[model samples]
Target: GDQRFGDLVFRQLAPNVWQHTSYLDMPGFGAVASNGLIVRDGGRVLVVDTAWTDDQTAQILNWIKQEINLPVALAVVTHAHQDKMGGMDALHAAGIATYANALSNQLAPQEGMVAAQHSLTFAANGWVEPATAPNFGPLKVFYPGPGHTSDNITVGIDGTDIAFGGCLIKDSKAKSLGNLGDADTEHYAASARAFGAAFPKASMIVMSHSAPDSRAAITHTARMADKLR
Candidate 1:
């Protein structure tokens, strides 16, 4: 059965894919919510991001084990920001392999954050650079270069037009860029547009926060990027 923990909730977005959301108290942003994806493919489950805390992440894992009856295969943290990978320690402690891009690995520690257990270093090298679709079984990871963070990337499931945009894409109601602490403001718009172009067929976008929706995400974010003067 699907459950909710305070502001944390997990709901099915499709047959085997689920979306998890949790909240954090941002000093000036009030109650901020973050989104993560749980994809159950075949006998394994893949978690896109780990929510806000270990308990919240554990809840998602527990639901998968109890409801889906599949082992967690791997977790891909979108960027170096804690909002994207805060529960990584819990994932690693559970023996689930966690991965992030090379730039994320390098910046996490510098930002006083923990890095993912594994580094997809090939991404930053030339192997899986922009435009390349590196994958993990049925899941695909696309790096469209710097936007919200230098290492931000999006994850997609094969045969499905769903994409976990991480923090690279903003929600419909976002009036601003949200957070620019580690963002590449000068190149954010271009990065976002490039991402949207790379996934022209993506019908549903799972942003790091807010409700998942269609192409409005790309347009909204691009518009905000342009409004930043």
Candidate 2:
């Protein structure tokens, strides 16, 4: 419960799902606590969004090995932000196959963050993982156009009722769209609606900067995106 900068803890949310929290120290914005997920299924682990930094990610990998006792079969990054992919080197170094949207792969290097080893192609409603690759049972990567970033995507855990909203879906406590440097303002609200519609069963949505909450956060985020423009 107590580590550093809001306790870098990986607390269990459900039977095989855990939420990992790490601190991102933004000079003007104080310490922004970021969230990701560690889901275990079929004797393996799948992570959503890496820890905020390399050091934190290294520790998180050790924690997963020691606590969860399973090999991380796959990892998915929602966007190109450091808070989401800062530990790319660590994951790449450990040989864990991480995946991201093709656009995110292009943007990651531009922003100086390492991208996942693999890239998912976009089709129709969202990004689709390669059928040739091993999947985490029932997770779907939905790209709702763009809200938090041009390449942001959300991962919904099918049958599990938990979705990794990352930064695209805001926390219920968020008053404004935190960062809009690369936001698709015109399509943000629409994208949120698409995300909500795609994963209506996602009752528990895990956000990047707040606690896991209900679908109301999607509602809140859509409204905020609407107001921003």
Candidate 3:
């Protein structure tokens, strides 16, 4: 069922969660993939990020509606990037409530995406529950300052050890920070380390561009960040 859609695939990671992946045709890199998450809980589902585009996102919704048989309660766009917010319109069309932190919403449109329907506010960096729905009360959002993007945040299913590491982190296999075009150079390394300090409880990290893995992978990325000069 995961391959029911040609461009997308889903891998179950927990009793109520699955890791979803799709690709971006990078100029020279062939097909570059990105990861997101789907959590089915409270009789509803939560989509962590969109597939690479609107159409792909529609396919994701179709898969959920038909295979999972649950209403999508909300969505969390990790940042303003296309990999995260490319399908804001699709979610809106499906009448699914969506959220991103205030700063992320402010930046989404600049990248050609509609800002999420709601904002998760924070004084600095802490957990912000964006919904009253049973499905989302455990849906915790944490901002680890600027790393991959100014508004990048990790969306975690509070009660579980799983957390969407956003595009801010890389799997242990990566040797460099994927793209620093909009990165916070001076703050990136610190921001990378902040992830562990902020969400120390997270063990299963669903990192973008790679399969879901242990939090040690977060350290690998942070170590690479430290190597930047």
Candidate 4:
């Protein structure tokens, strides 16, 4: 059956980096999705995370096609999940390089990974992997140490005054840390602390699911984390 997807938007966030919003169940996934971003520069496009369904993933890709020919130069699967990294096969097929914590590779044969990559083939919605590993931009990869999913990775785009935080950071809503079934509340909170210690120097915070902004959002999550602690 067709799991109708929706269109995500690329708000030209920074100079070359664009913030793409994944349509979550509205108020449901906002905490995580808002923290994801798609940073692009030169001919290389960096995709932070692949959303839920092909419909959602296609919306992001379609935006890229309309903007430039550079396929997702590099893909950083923020944590490790279908909603965030589900379209890995599609992105890779497009010829883009995959950059995730060594942990992502650990998901091999996992139901989530298998379902995320394979579901596209069985459904009407189809996705293509990136054609080539995007000559990654100057930004470096930052891991706050096994928070969120024991492999949350952030991409720091040098010179762009931008850093892409997958589900590592929460949106500016006092929303409960999001789906707890596949997360580590304690460690995830710890990772957020690490992001705070490291990202204080950054000019702005671009996330996977929400608007591109800064620490102001952290307050919401901070308070929420207090309960978890």
TM-score of each: 0.89, 0.93, 0.92, 0.75
Off by over 4 Å in 3: 1-4, 129-135
RMSD of each: 2.9, 2.0, 2.1, 8.6
Q: Which regions in candidate 2 have their CA more than 4 angstroms from the true location?
A: 1-7, 127-133
Q: Estimate the TM-score for candidate 1.
A: 0.89
RMSD to native, candidate 3: 2.1
Per-residue lDDT of model 1, residues 27-138, tens digit only: 9779888888888878888888887777777777777777788789888888877777778778988898888887788888887667886677544322344332233666
What's the best-to-worst order under TM-score?
2, 3, 1, 4
lDDT of each: 0.78, 0.83, 0.81, 0.59
Model 2: clashing residue pairs? none
lDDT of 1 at 52: 77
Error of 4 at 100 (Å): 1.6
User: Which parts of model 4 are misplaced by more than 4 Å?
Assistant: 1-6, 24-35, 114-135
Candidate number with greatest lDDT: 2
> Between candidates 1 and 2, which one is better according to TM-score?
2
Report how far residue 45 has shifted in candidate 1, in Å. 0.4
Best by the TM-score measure = 2
Better of 1 and 3 by lDDT: 3
lDDT of 2 by residue, 55-149 (tens): 88888888888887988888888899988999999998888888888889999988989878887777785657446235746668878787778
Arrange candidates by lDDT, descending: 2, 3, 1, 4
